[PDB]
Amino acid sequence: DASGVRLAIVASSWHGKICDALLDGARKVAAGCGLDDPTVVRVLGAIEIPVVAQELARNHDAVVALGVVIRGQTPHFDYVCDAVTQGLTRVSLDSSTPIANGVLTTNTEEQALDRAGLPTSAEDKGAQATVAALATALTLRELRAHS
Amino acid sequence: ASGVRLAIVASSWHGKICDALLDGARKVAAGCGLDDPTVVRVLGAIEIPVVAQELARNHDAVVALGVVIRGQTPHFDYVCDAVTQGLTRVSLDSSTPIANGVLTTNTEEQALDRAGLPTSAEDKGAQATVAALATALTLRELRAHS
Amino acid sequence: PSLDASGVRLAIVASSWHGKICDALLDGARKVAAGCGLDDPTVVRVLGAIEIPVVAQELARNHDAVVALGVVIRGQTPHFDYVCDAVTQGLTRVSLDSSTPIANGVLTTNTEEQALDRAGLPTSAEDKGAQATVAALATALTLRELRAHS
Amino acid sequence: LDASGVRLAIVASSWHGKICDALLDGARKVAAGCGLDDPTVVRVLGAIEIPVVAQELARNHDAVVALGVVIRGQTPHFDYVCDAVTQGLTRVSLDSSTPIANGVLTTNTEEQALDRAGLPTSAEDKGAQATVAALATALTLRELRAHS
Amino acid sequence: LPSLDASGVRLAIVASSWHGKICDALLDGARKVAAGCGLDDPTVVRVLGAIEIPVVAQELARNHDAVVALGVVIRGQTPHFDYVCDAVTQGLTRVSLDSSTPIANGVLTTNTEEQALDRAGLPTSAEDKGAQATVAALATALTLRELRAHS
Numbered sequence: 001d002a003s004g005v006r007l008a009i010v011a012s013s014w015h016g017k018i019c020d021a022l023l024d025g026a027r028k029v030a031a032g033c034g035l036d037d038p039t040v041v042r043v044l045g046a047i048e049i050p051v052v053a054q055e056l057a058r059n060h061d062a063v064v065a066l067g068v069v070i071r072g073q074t075p076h077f078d079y080v081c082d083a084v085t086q087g088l089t090r091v092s093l094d095s096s097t098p099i100a101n102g103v104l105t106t107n108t109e110e111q112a113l114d115r116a117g118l119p120t121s122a123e124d125k126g127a128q129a130t131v132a133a134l135a136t137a138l139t140l141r142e143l144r145a146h147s
Numbered sequence: 148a149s150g151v152r153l154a155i156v157a158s159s160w161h162g163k164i165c166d167a168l169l170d171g172a173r174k175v176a177a178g179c180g181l182d183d184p185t186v187v188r189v190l191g192a193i194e195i196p197v198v199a200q201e202l203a204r205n206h207d208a209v210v211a212l213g214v215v216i217r218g219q220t221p222h223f224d225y226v227c228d229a230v231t232q233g234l235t236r237v238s239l240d241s242s243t244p245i246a247n248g249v250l251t252t253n254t255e256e257q258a259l260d261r262a263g264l265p266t267s268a269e270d271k272g273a274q275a276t277v278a279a280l281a282t283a284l285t286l287r288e289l290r291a292h293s
Numbered sequence: 294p295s296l297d298a299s300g301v302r303l304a305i306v307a308s309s310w311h312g313k314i315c316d317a318l319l320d321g322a323r324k325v326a327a328g329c330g331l332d333d334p335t336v337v338r339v340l341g342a343i344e345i346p347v348v349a350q351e352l353a354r355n356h357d358a359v360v361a362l363g364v365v366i367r368g369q370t371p372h373f374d375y376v377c378d379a380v381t382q383g384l385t386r387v388s389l390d391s392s393t394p395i396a397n398g399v400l401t402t403n404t405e406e407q408a409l410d411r412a413g414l415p416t417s418a419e420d421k422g423a424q425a426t427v428a429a430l431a432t433a434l435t436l437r438e439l440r441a442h443s
Numbered sequence: 444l445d446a447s448g449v450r451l452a453i454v455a456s457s458w459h460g461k462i463c464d465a466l467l468d469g470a471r472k473v474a475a476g477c478g479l480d481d482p483t484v485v486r487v488l489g490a491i492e493i494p495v496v497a498q499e500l501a502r503n504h505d506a507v508v509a510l511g512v513v514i515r516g517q518t519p520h521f522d523y524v525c526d527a528v529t530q531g532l533t534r535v536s537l538d539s540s541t542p543i544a545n546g547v548l549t550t551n552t553e554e555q556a557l558d559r560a561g562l563p564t565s566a567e568d569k570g571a572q573a574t575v576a577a578l579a580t581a582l583t584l585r586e587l588r589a590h591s
Numbered sequence: 592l593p594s595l596d597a598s599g600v601r602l603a604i605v606a607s608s609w610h611g612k613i614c615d616a617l618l619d620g621a622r623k624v625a626a627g628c629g630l631d632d633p634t635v636v637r638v639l640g641a642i643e644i645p646v647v648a649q650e651l652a653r654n655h656d657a658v659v660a661l662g663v664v665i666r667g668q669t670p671h672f673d674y675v676c677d678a679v680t681q682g683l684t685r686v687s688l689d690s691s692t693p694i695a696n697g698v699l700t701t702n703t704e705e706q707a708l709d710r711a712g713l714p715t716s717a718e719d720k721g722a723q724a725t726v727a728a729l730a731t732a733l734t735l736r737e738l739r740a741h742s
């Protein structure tokens with residue numbers, strides 16, 4: 001059970017259908033664990049996630065970062081994903097808070113659809129990341145001060 | 148977004164494309180009720196983060212604009228690495244959205260097509276400004292207000 | 294140096310993605326620990342490798358050494374690279390922030406076969422879980438000798 | 444313009460002496476043209492040694508120019524040396540709030556490095572370019588910072 | 592390299608042990624440069640792998656003017672090579688800037704064993720990166736000594 005944990009979810013909006021599916025999977029895991037109302041924030045792109053995740057981390061036991069980065073024609077994909085990786089890792093360690101990475105980094109749109117948790121998808125990384133965030137928050141709760 | 152304080156730092160390497168990105172940035176700003184954002188010019192993309200850091204002390208959002216085109220050497224990779232590392236750090240250090248409108252392309256054609264010129268497919272300068280403003284407004288709603 | 298280490302406080306954080314291989318790594322870690330006079334190290338489980346650094350950071354506050362264990366296998370997307378980047382960045386930062394050895398027993402493989410071959414199963418060529426724990430304990434003992442003791 | 448008041452430091456590595464001296468020559472010439480006859484010039488052995496010296500120079504200078512030549516060899520060592528320089532200089536710049544200009548050449552061949560050093564027959568001078576970059580940014584930050 | 596005194600500089604050497612023969616050769620080259628510069632007894636610490644270097648380098652940096660990092664990373668079958676070298680790069684660069692101390696990189700990052708042998712300073716090797724890194728550390732420590740507060 002994870003009813004006591006304060007969960008935040010930050011989801012980017014670039015590729016709306018896939019982003020909403022990831023968020024759907026996140027909210028479903030949250031509600032299944034006894035959390036009907038997690039803090040849900042929307043940002044435009046994946047680069048905007050870390051700075052919002054940092055704000056959310058000040059008031060929550062866990063933050064789920066959700067987004068979809070699909071490779072285009074330029075090397076820009078690599079550096080967007082690099083920024084997200086660097087940002088979320090820093091935010092997690094700065095705040096000592098699990099920042100779960102449900103940010104899809106795919107070569108094609110099909111690969112992103114297949115990992116969003118749609119009807120015919122093979123997996124749901126939005127669901128997976130929320131499990132990851134909540135379990136780590138509960139683990140840290142057991143590791144931290146409680147008399 | 149009339150209340151948000153916006154700064155724009157744009158490098159100058161590849162002037163035509165950099166001015167187009169800045170044009171797209173200014174137009175989004177003005178459309179959102181911001182006629183005069185703080186606009187600073189730097190020479191290259193490596194010079195952006197340290198100026199972005201200065202601008203972040205006095206602004207709710209900073210838009211980083213620039214054009215990095217791959218040449219003959221691996222130098223492209225390390226310039227883009229420095230920008231990525233710098234802007235990400237600045238954003239988290241200052242708790243300020245630092246939007247990345249810095250183009251990282253293989254060819255000049257790809258950069259032109261993403262600058263927002265008459266025949267361009269997209270305007271990344273415009274997109275970055277929307278990104279910066281929306282995140283600044285989001286953080287304003289998330290932060291202290293009684 | 295795997296010979297002595299009874300006084301060292303050891304933590305082991307192991308992710309769970311690819312359970313069989315993760316348990317094998319943890320098995321190798323626990324066996325090295327027990328052989329060095331440490332029957333009860335702090336063992337924490339996390340879901341994925343991304344979750345390791347923040348737990349490793351917590352464990353580093355009250356342990357002389359932390360062993361990070363996990364299995365990252367390349368899939369269809371570039372996601373593999375960025376997961377491994379986050380772990381690398383995270384563990385390196387945690388080690389230097391806390392001045393504590395954070396041993397990397399996180400497998401970073403192209404295929405499942407390569408991960409199985411490095412977990413320390415019956416037929417495996419090596420055990421990276423065992424290797425990382427030797428690495429963590431030896432470094433903790435080294436730092437103990439380098440640090441203040443009158 | 445008028446960069447006479449800015450305090451400039453130049454740190455140049457020594458690995459590939461001819462090319463490193465050419466980069467330094469271009470740096471010194473831009474400096475002198477901007478009204479700075481005597482910038483602080485420090486030499487280091489390799490490019491890895493630059494950031495820690497750049498950090499020291501940054502405490503007492505408005506701008507630091509990092510100069511060096513990294514040419515790819517037989518091993519992946521090239522990538523990690525350039526990674527360290529990139530990481531180091533970017534950190535130093537933001538730690539000190541000081542422009543640390545990157546005039547460190549990262550080339551596949553020696554010809555490419557020669558062509559970017561500002562020798563008689565070179566296509567460009569990255570040592571000159573980096574000094575312009577450092578000075579302009581230092582002047583920009585001076586205008587952005589406190590002055591009543 | 593024996594040309595200046597370097598007698599006053601406090602030198603630490605941290606060398607990993609993975610690939611013992613090559614690591615000992617790098618250390619040999621390091622100690623010989625040190626002794627030639629008037630330093631018979633530098634602080635020498637051994638670690639198991641290259642990932643263990645930065646945290647020990649950090650400790651050594653607290654009471655030495657220069658630290659030489661020595662090690663051998665040879666590419667295997669997996670991408671693990673890249674991430675080990677990334678960690679060392681990140682770690683040593685951070686430690687150097689945190690402590691304001693030259694942390695010389697004599698950590699070999701090679702595709703084959705032959706390439707590592709050729710850069711260790713063995714009888715038939717083309718170069719000695721252990722020797723080169725110690726020269727690099729000592730020269731930078733002397734340079735920083737001249738740049739810092741004195742008198």
Ligand SMILES: CCC(=O)N[C@@H]1C(=O)NC(=O)N=C1NC[C@H](O)[C@H](O)[C@H](O)CO
Pocket residue numbers: 012013014044045046047048067068069070071072076077080245246247248274275278279
């Ligand atoms: C591959 C790059 C691309 O075409 N689109 C990416 C993308 O794939 N996914 C995304 O969320 N945001 C993007 N770009 C927006 C970016 O995250 C920022 O919002 C922007 O750089 C301004 O900061």
Ligand SMILES: CCC(=O)N[C@@H]1C(=O)NC(=O)N=C1NC[C@H](O)[C@H](O)[C@H](O)CO
Pocket residue numbers: 158159160190191192193194213214215216217218222223226543544545546572573576577
């Ligand atoms: C591919 C590299 C190149 O030829 N030019 C790049 C480039 O593509 N784009 C850019 O904005 N600045 C550059 N170089 C200038 C650089 O950002 C710095 O100003 C320079 O390193 C000095 O600090």
Ligand SMILES: CCC(=O)N[C@@H]1C(=O)NC(=O)N=C1NC[C@H](O)[C@H](O)[C@H](O)CO
Pocket residue numbers: 099100101102128129132133308309310340341342343344363364365366367368372373376
């Ligand atoms: C190639 C990526 C993949 O398909 N699975 C990896 C994997 O191979 N190993 C792993 O431990 N965790 C994974 N993913 C989960 C990840 O570590 C985090 O739990 C997730 O990003 C939520 O924070």
Ligand SMILES: CCC(=O)N[C@@H]1C(=O)NC(=O)N=C1NC[C@H](O)[C@H](O)[C@H](O)CO
Pocket residue numbers: 456457458488489490491492511512513514515516520521524694695696697723724727
């Ligand atoms: C990797 C390519 C190479 O063979 N040599 C490079 C190089 O190309 N350029 C350089 O300045 N220094 C090097 N190596 C020395 C390095 O910068 C440090 O001085 C050394 O690692 C000690 O820390």
Ligand SMILES: CCC(=O)N[C@@H]1C(=O)NC(=O)N=C1NC[C@H](O)[C@H](O)[C@H](O)CO
Pocket residue numbers: 395396397398424425428607608609639640641642643662663664665666667671672675
């Ligand atoms: C990646 C190639 C490999 O198979 N082994 C390398 C290697 O080549 N060299 C090395 O010194 N240490 C290794 N591995 C050990 C590593 O440095 C750490 O000790 C380990 O990850 C525990 O922290």
Ligand SMILES: [K+]
Pocket residue numbers: 057058059060061095096097
């Ligand atoms: K928190």
Ligand SMILES: [K+]
Pocket residue numbers: 142143144145146
């Ligand atoms: K407890």
Ligand SMILES: [K+]
Pocket residue numbers: 203204205206207208241242243
């Ligand atoms: K601000």
Ligand SMILES: [K+]
Pocket residue numbers: 288289290291292
């Ligand atoms: K609020």
Ligand SMILES: [K+]
Pocket residue numbers: 353354355356357391392393
């Ligand atoms: K500790």
Ligand SMILES: [K+]
Pocket residue numbers: 438439440441442
């Ligand atoms: K002692």
Ligand SMILES: [K+]
Pocket residue numbers: 501502503504505506539540541
């Ligand atoms: K300064």
Ligand SMILES: [K+]
Pocket residue numbers: 586587588589590
């Ligand atoms: K002013």
Ligand SMILES: [K+]
Pocket residue numbers: 652653654655656657690691692
């Ligand atoms: K020191």
Ligand SMILES: [K+]
Pocket residue numbers: 737738739740741
């Ligand atoms: K002095």
